[PDB]
Amino acid sequence: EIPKPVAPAPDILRCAYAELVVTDLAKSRNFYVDVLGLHVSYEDENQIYLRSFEEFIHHNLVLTKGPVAALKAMAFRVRTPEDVDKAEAYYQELGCRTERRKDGFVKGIGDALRVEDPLGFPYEFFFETTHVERLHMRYDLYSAGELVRLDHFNQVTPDVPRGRKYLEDLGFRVTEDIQDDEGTTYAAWMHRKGTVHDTALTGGNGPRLHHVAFSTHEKHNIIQICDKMGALRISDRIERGPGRHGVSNAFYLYILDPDNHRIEIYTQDYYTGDPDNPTITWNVHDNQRRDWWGNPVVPSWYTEASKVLDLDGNVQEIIERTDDSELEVTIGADGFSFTRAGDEDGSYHGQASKGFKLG
Amino acid sequence: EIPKPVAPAPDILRCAYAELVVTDLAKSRNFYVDVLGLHVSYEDENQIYLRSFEEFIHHNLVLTKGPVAALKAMAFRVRTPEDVDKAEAYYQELGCRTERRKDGFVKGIGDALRVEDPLGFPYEFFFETTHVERLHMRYDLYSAGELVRLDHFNQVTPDVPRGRKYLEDLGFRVTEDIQDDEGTTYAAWMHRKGTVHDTALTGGNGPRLHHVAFSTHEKHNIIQICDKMGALRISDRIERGPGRHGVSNAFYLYILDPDNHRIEIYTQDYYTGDPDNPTITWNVHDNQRRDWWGNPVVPSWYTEASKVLDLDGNVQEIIERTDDSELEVTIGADGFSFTRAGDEDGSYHGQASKGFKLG
Amino acid sequence: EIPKPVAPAPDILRCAYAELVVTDLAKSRNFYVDVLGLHVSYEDENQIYLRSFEEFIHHNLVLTKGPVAALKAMAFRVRTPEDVDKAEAYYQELGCRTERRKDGFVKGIGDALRVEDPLGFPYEFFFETTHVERLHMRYDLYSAGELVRLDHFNQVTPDVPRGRKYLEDLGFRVTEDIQDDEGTTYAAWMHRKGTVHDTALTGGNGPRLHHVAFSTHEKHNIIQICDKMGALRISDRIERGPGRHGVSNAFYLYILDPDNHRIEIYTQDYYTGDPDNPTITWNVHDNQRRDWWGNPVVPSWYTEASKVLDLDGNVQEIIERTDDSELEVTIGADGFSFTRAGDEDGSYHGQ
Amino acid sequence: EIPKPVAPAPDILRCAYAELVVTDLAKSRNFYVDVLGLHVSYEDENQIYLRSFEEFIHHNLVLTKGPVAALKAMAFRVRTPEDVDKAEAYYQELGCRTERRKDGFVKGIGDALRVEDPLGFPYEFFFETTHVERLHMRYDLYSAGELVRLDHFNQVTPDVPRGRKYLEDLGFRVTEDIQDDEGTTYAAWMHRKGTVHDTALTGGNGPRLHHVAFSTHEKHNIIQICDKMGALRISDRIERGPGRHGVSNAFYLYILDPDNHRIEIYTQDYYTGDPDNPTITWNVHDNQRRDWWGNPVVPSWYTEASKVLDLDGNVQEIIERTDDSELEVTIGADGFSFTRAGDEDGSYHGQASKG
């Protein structure tokens, strides 16, 4: 029911940056710069512009001081200047609100288009950006937990197939998904850049931003972030992990910033650039689908997510999911999951894996 | 309570091997050889003799077929032939039942003394052992999850201070422990070889064997064990982890063998060989003491452990712990844990960390 | 001076496989399967088809028994079936010899075009391929040295600018190169898939195949290959490395198969998918350009490379490079390199 | 030739610290703290006291400003205060010069004995030391190249068998050595703490200090040290490696400090604490003995080493080795090495491996 426009989709390269509204800029800076080691491209009393170790565009993360913590924009780089025009025509044909600024919404971005998309998310499309020193060989700066790239976003939306169809028309290709035997979709992952995803849809009340993910080189870099958070006595901000994902096969960690924005650290997924890249569908009851080692998924992972803003900076109203809840069908009192399909040994009924119930 | 003998203690080098009784030898072989990659020194219809990658003594693990799965012996190597005589005299003075076999209890061990120690555990002391090819540079054999050394044992016993004093008199030095502000010791770690430990006491009903631990070279090796267990669809046999320990600072994983004997994989603890090595005491309510990252300790970790045998091969009767339960005081109904001492934020009252409760 | 065809270029996805002729198939199998741990997709008495851990197409490497060890085909996957037609029209316009087999040249590949390209290299273009089990989560099979993807080829050719322009016309984008102040190009790296390269041109006598490269997940996997080669007492087959590259920033190792085909093991280069990806030019005298740690490049790495075959299976005649030699200008008797530009300390002259 | 004293040997725990005389304290600080990330226990205008990540004794390295760069002391910790007395009586009986100071020679060490040992090296034995914060869990400080422990020293000495017998009587156990088929010993490694070594003897003109070695947790930490040195454009201070050793099986790297004092970064050797630990002897012509991957050993690694000082602070005179030279027999003009014993293929005649 989101129609395919007659207008051609913009050619999207990759996820490029997020703008997050934060309430205390100094506390946020401590987290992203001092704890996580991201590199400052620009900062003032109002905003902090941050990039990963291997980035050459101006930034991967913009922290903007504001009254209500929320996602303000998730930005995708398009292939040419003309693709911004294509994005504008595309979303206008969808009847979405758009705003076009020839000199950008944030520093280091040129001609850019922001839109309130059909799922209620603030997307940005841009080509022009200020190139900065690519720090990829600055091993004099390299931290034991170095974040090397922006990898993806993850969005919470009530109707996954509706959103997926819309993203496929935009050019994103589905790589993996989670479904049940009676036709409910719980989550889908989709890419432009040849990794498992650039964005992903997680079934839930929405629009909300589930997380932004950065990559490391190696698994030990993710271990170090955990170790460093323990040393800083902020282990309570480690939400979930570390682990190996089923979907994507990446090694992962989820942590929470000072405003509870969720950040994933992620490494070593696989190549998806071929157009007949085999899709993988997982059963929602498979306890190795999210954590391959069977570790239980914390309920906050399923329930909590950041607000998103519309183009005036007001919070988007949330619409409730009516399809089945992943939490409820897997780890709730009526849930279940299995280690081996069909085997009662290693299956969990009315609780999570490993001997825990919901707190 | 356990008196210091007048007889000199044996000079103990290190933990050397454990003999575990298993119910199905083939299934147990599949676990230790095919899944974990231990190296077969000898086997027959009744026993499998296994060693780690860097070992030169005959074995680190003996699997013995029997009717009831149990620990049959935890074995420590002593410095000289004469230390076996010292051991016999020492335990005889302690009023303990002992058995001496000039040609060993298991193949590849010579003159050996087994004892029913004052905590009810079957200890063996030996010097003589058949040397085998040390595989430390056999990289043609090296597995992605290679177990390189035997590291320690961990024993469940109801009265930790009683056992701790006895082990200190035997020459083990306590490196770390867990206590509360009311005089209760929950656990202690003690060594001879200059690592955090060779054995350890965990407060609980006993005597029972909590685990046997093997080490890997690096953290990624432990990750690979998890990943392989996922691939073999036996993730339900991963009990707890992987993680970073608070006590010991080691990276760790706990898995369960076919008879539910617990095995820990462990790496990168610190040097303790100096006689005034600083002893570290953690508070039992510190939520970073067991898992540095704050991840909850599954209840089975506190409640489940292996039976131990007496010298006749009969199961030792279990004596109930009357001191406070670590489980109860941290994750139980009236339990409490903190992330930062004296901060309510990041504390847990009557449940586990990260959003979980006891199943 | 290779003219751009008016015919549209095929849309190339990536490097996909190489077909190497080997003289002793069993010896070759020992190296690629037992030492290196590649996964068998098919074998018989004449060929072995091998793939890396994360591959879903039929193979990344075909070993074919033949009388003379050589590269028989370096194969690139194209985006659609129609791109094979585009490739045929493109190379035909270039005046190249071509051969189309609607049922493929090797097993597991369908409609395929092979060509003797303008640099004398046997290129293949195909879309159709038999999908196989993607082993990316088969950690029960995973080796301590596991090879997880095919990453790139490297080609020895006498005139780098000439080849570079030809590959740019084909849609490859240069990511890094090596030049001097006099204006000589010694090497160039170029990509389609968004890594530092899918192929690369090394200045030298050619056409010859310098190496085929596979990636690992982590640096320790490369270390393990070395360690295993020591344990197998074949450390003499370790040619160069392990190291960190300057160009590409990748951790690397070069080893030699039983017919002296050079295999690179490679990991952790960077993303190049943006069309304005900044191009990095290194000076040929910078001693950190090839090995970032300043370790010397053994002369064999510059002088040795594999023969390539024409479409009849005969060895391609070789053309001598007339441009300056990177070996000669860096480690030859009149060569030099520096650690810090302009500093005699940490410089090497004739050495 | 060096007699075994009647007096009991001291019970030596491990190598504990080295005192290095350096010429420019600021440059040495930049290397050891800024490049390598060692932790400052104490510093003033004359000395920098440094320790590794997991250490609790006051320091593993003392950098002392002086006119001539050299080893001033290689220190071993002993098990009890009474073992310093035992050390003293032992070295007096050996006829060695000794000097004992109840309040130590450097800050952070108490009662200490220093000796000019029978091979001409300045050994210190102590028990008493000031405990400091053990940083083993301070992951807020942890560097990508973090040095976690002091592992060993390596000493250059002309007659290895002579030295080996002496260290053995002192309680060190030989774990590995290098010999040839003609009765010559080229190197030996020996331990107290249950690793491959606490010190080692390399055949060569001496006494000289070959290197001091620090451990990392993992192989990637050593790789990061190389990468950082490249980024700082000081790759010319990487001498050798990184590699896998044959002897010891450890992953390694050799780098040079501003006074050319050689530092090794080392990780993942094996447990040697059993008294019948099997000794491993390598042939000197085995090209996998030093670098398991057969990478060539640069001649500077065999020829260059640091001066050592006597108890008065003067440089020890160097005695020339007359036994065969490892450099000459493996990579010199008449040198030879093999990959596979008895196989001509993969052997090197009169030159180093790998072209």
Ligand SMILES: O=[N+]([O-])c1ccc(O)c(O)c1
């Ligand atoms: O398996 N899932 O839990 C996944 C897989 C990949 C992701 O990036 C993620 O956020 C969740």
Ligand SMILES: O=[N+]([O-])c1ccc(O)c(O)c1
């Ligand atoms: O730095 N060069 O020596 C390089 C860089 C990347 C490569 O894949 C290579 O084969 C050589």
Ligand SMILES: O=[N+]([O-])c1ccc(O)c(O)c1
């Ligand atoms: O094998 N050798 O070259 C070795 C082995 C261990 C060492 O610590 C060393 O400095 C050299």
Ligand SMILES: [Ca+2]
């Ligand atoms: Ca209390």
Ligand SMILES: [Cl-]
């Ligand atoms: Cl624990």
Ligand SMILES: [Co+2]
């Ligand atoms: Co994600």
Ligand SMILES: [Co+2]
């Ligand atoms: Co343990």
Ligand SMILES: [Co+2]
């Ligand atoms: Co290459």
Ligand SMILES: [Co+2]
């Ligand atoms: Co050394």
